[PDB]
């Protein structure tokens, strides 16, 4: 189905109707139970080379905002941690809920955060395209960053300044010179597990790298993402007030930690 969303009749619970992998064995997001998580000394240092001129556009997909990056070069790449080879930056988006008390996709020892930032990368060492890589178990790597309610994050301004211009699904605007690096928290300690896209088609192609340390967002900043529409110009307006999928069962998978 081309009309999945987060409303009552198209939301997460209904996605299994058209995407039965929703009930798969490597579905994301998940709950992270820290007492069960083992530190893995075989994890290499996480290496993050990001070039601000890589960013090209921001658009409203109807499901989030998407910052798209020029990904035919290795100017912005994620290496190390659990990864074999170079994963090229593709895009950035965000998940939130209708209220500040929850809205993260991953939930850590019962704790949810206000929002969760995802940085999507694809294995250009093996696959010809993001689209192809999305269908391979080792094709994608997504870095998740929790956002907790806190004093305002000046590093979100480039993004929040654009939201009016992309109110309607399908809108896009020029977006370059984007300091993605500064959106990350100081500490890059993370958990990692094999999982999926958190959005249809829910492909089980993602090495998840979920950072332990949250960054801040104010309640005022976060409210602005909720006045995005999930509807296109000329369609009955509906607001994108929540766009997060619930944690799915581990089903035997084990979460590893970069740190002890
Ligand atoms: N929540 S998630 O990180 O799993 C995620 C997205 F939500 C997402 F929209 C994309 S996409 O790049 O925009 C198109 C493939 O779905 C992704 F590639 C992707 F990985
Ligand atoms: Zn996401």
Kindly describe this structure.
The structure is a monomer. The protein has a single domain, classed as Carbonic Anhydrase II (Roll), CATH 3.10.200.10. The protein is 8% helix and 30% strand. By secondary structure, it is mainly beta. The longest helix has 7 residues. Strands 2, 3, 4, 5, 6, 7, 9, 10, 11, 12, 13, 14 and 15 form a 13-stranded mixed β-sheet that branches. The relative contact order is 0.25. A hairpin with a 5-residue loop joins strand 6 and strand 7. The radius of gyration is 17 Å and the shape is globular. It has 4 helices and 15 strands. It binds the ligand NS(=O)(=O)c1c(F)c(F)c(S(=O)(=O)CCO)c(F)c1F and zinc ion (ZN). Zinc ion binds next to strand 7.
Tally the structural domains: 1
- The CATH class is Alpha Beta
Q: What ligand species are in this complex?
A: ligand V13, zinc ion
CATH topology group: Carbonic Anhydrase II
* Main sheet attributes: strand count, strand direction, barrel closure: 13 strands, mixed
The CATH superfamily appears as Alpha carbonic anhydrase
Helical element count? 4
Q: What is the rounded Rg?
A: 17 Å
Order of helices and strands: HEEEEEEEEEHEHEEEEHE
How much helicity do the residues have?
A: under 10%
Distance between the termini: 43 Å
> How many strand elements?
15
Catalytic activity: hydrogencarbonate + H(+) = CO2 + H2O
GO molecular function: carbonate dehydratase activity; zinc ion binding
Cofactor: Zn(2+)
Keywords: Lyase, Metal-binding, Zinc
